[PDB]
Amino acid sequence: AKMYEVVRVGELGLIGEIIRLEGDKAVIQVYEETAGVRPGEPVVGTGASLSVELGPGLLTSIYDGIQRPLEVIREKTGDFIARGVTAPALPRDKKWHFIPKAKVGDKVVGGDIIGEVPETSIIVHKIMVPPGIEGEIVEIAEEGDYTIEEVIAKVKTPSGEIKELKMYQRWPVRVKRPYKEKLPPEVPLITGQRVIDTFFPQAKGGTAAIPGAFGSGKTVTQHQLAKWSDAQVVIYIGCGERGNEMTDVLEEFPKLKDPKTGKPLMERTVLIANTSNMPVAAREASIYTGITIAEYFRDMGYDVALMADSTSRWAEALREISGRGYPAYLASKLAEFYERAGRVVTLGSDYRVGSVSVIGAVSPPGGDFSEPVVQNTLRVVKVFWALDADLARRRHFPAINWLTSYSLYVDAVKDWWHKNIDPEWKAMRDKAMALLQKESELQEIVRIVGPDALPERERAILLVARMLREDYLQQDAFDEVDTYCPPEKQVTMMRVLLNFYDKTMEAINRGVPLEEIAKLPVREEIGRMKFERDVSKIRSLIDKTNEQFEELFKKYGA
């Protein structure tokens, strides 16, 4: 009997005589397991690999799990149903402006950039020698307009073999794109969101997760990350977790502006879509397709952000087996996916660095986690931003719980902050975090015994922790200034707050009543500094704080 592990649509897991797992569209099957063409049930093998096309055409595109383009059908009750159609990944009709960057006689290796194509108004697409090709450029195209199938260069290998190069290349999605070296985490992916960059930093090339649960301001946070992180290119996977998602992706996504250029965000984005309507095999393949495309852009020397929010549609690619699916293996590959994240010295003759940072949504079963998509080789994820519904209901925005979130990149990125931005960055965050932890402990004790017997010193810690939460952790994504917080602004707002802490504890020491400090006028300016775009005006709050505390030391014995 045929196990019909999929409905006859767009891909299936084929298990052969002696070799397990391959895939097709019609009945002709591209294969991971090498095979000997013509097993049981009329199945004929092919060239080989499940692969993607990489060249001009990727940007602004929407694909399914195996890089076949759109085709949509109209309304319903979800109202936009989409499916992957057998057509070409990169348009064969369009003319691209090719600019040569190499010349006849140049020696080249894989990764070398031999030309450039302005693909969109945002991104210059770098044309690269495919991995494993090297030798002498014996022929190269003149500046001009060409379709993707046109040969733009010829390379003679050391054998004398002549290789024909196009503006695009193919790569098997299940094989990591090669590079020279994976560099240790070091440079932060700057999100411009205070709580993240300060307390739970992402490294360029790092791995982060958020809860996939709707609400808590997830789509706001995902939108903020996609548009503000200092990655040049975004690869987004999902689009199918709710009924209306595809609808919003077709109507609204072309409207979104890259705030850094004023141009459409789609002009540095590639979308991969996973839906209930699509074959279970394509959705399994989707993450590999996405990360291969991400790697391909890092190879050019770009920082890229691979963002996935498709847990339920991806996870429901769960399937029946009989024979042996695979116990200590179902999370071993998810590991190999996350393992493909990294900042690397890329292939090429020039020293060149690119990265893929991964931000993935994680949804166990519903609310509380157990074992589903949670805690196998968990330490594969180094950052967790714990979007928290309770915080959302208290209207604390970005609803990131600062007690259950973590980052293992704090020490990895501190040196970049110390030498480029502020020598005290790490000392200041640790100090602020200790205050938040103390506040939490105090709030729990108070819950029990009441707030009435609180000494001044503890009331002061509570006052300043509250200022940290309101003036620093809370950030307004909808505000034209506070939508992004530059690194220099982040450290300056922190110094203002921590200097206010220092002066508060000092004042209390010299017998200044806390009610006097709570009403210090500068406090309300500290409450609004996130809205101030001029960082020098924010810095001037340090002296203004100092001065006002002086007038307090005067109104008292000091």
Q: Is the dihedral of CA 470, 473, 477, 481 positive or negative?
A: positive
What does this entry list as its resolution, in Å?
A: 2.4
Superfamily name and number for 51-93+166-407? P-loop containing nucleotide triphosphate hydrolases (3.40.50.300)
What would the DSSP string read from start to end of 243-280? TTHHHHHHHTTTT-B-TTTSSBGGGGEEEEE--TTS-H
Within a 13 Å sphere around the CA of 49, how many CA atoms are in the beta-carbon half? 11
CB 525 within 8 A of CB 471: no
Tell me how far apart the alpha carbons of residues 219 and 230 are, in angstroms, rounded to a whole number.
19
Q: Cα torsion at 269, 272, 275, 281 (round to 10°)?
A: -170
- In the block, tokens 């009989």 appear at 322
Q: What Rg value do the Cα atoms of the chain yield, rounded?
A: 27
At 305, list the tokens: 């952000």
* Nearest alpha carbon to residue 153 among 131, 126, 124, 129: 129
Tally of CB atoms within 10 A around 504: 24
- In the block, tokens 């991971």 appear at 32
CATH for 408-558 is 1.10.1140.10
* Nearest alpha carbon to residue 110 among 177, 205, 183: 177
* Nearest alpha carbon to residue 437 among 483, 476, 402: 402
Q: Cα–Cα distances in Å, from 493 out to 354, 429, 486? A: 31, 12, 11
End-to-end CA distance of the chain: give it in Å, rounded: 90
Burial class (CB in 10 A: 0-12, 13-18, 19+), 150: middle
At 316, list the tokens: 């429901």
Identify the H or E element spanning 447.
helix 425-449
State the span(s) of the chain assigned CATH 2.40.50.100: 94-165
Helix (H, G, I), strand (E, B) or coil at 533: coil
* Nearest alpha carbon to residue 459 among 478, 439, 488: 439
Assess if CATH 3.30.230.10 describes domain 94-165: no
Tell me how far apart the alpha carbons of residues 497 and 457 are, in angstroms, rounded to a whole number.
17
- The answer for residues whose C-beta is within 8 angstroms of residue 364's C-beta and 6 or more apart is 370, 371, 372, 373, 374
- The answer for residues whose C-beta is within 8 angstroms of residue 517's C-beta and 6 or more apart is 460, 463, 504, 507, 508, 552
Tell me how far apart the alpha carbons of residues 38 and 199 are, in angstroms, rounded to a whole number.
57
CB 400 within 8 A of CB 202: no
Tell me how far apart the alpha carbons of residues 212 and 386 are, in angstroms, rounded to a whole number.
10
| Beta strands at 135-140 and 107-108: parallel, antiparallel or unpaired | antiparallel
- In the block, tokens 């090498």 appear at 34
CB 60 within 8 A of CB 269: yes
Method: X-ray
* Nearest alpha carbon to residue 493 among 545, 453, 444: 545
Tally of CB atoms within 10 A around 440: 13
Which residues lie across from 100 on neighbouring strands?
Answer: 115
- The answer for residues whose C-beta is within 8 angstroms of residue 20's C-beta and 6 or more apart is 33
State the span(s) of the chain assigned CATH 2.30.30.650: 1-50
* Nearest alpha carbon to residue 272 among 256, 252, 249, 295: 249
State the span(s) of the chain assigned CATH 1.10.1140.10: 408-558
Beta-strand ranges (E) seen in 462-540 are none
Q: In this structure, which topology does domain 1-50 adopt according to CATH? A: SH3 type barrels. (2.30.30)
Tell me how far apart the alpha carbons of residues 347 and 400 are, in angstroms, rounded to a whole number.
38
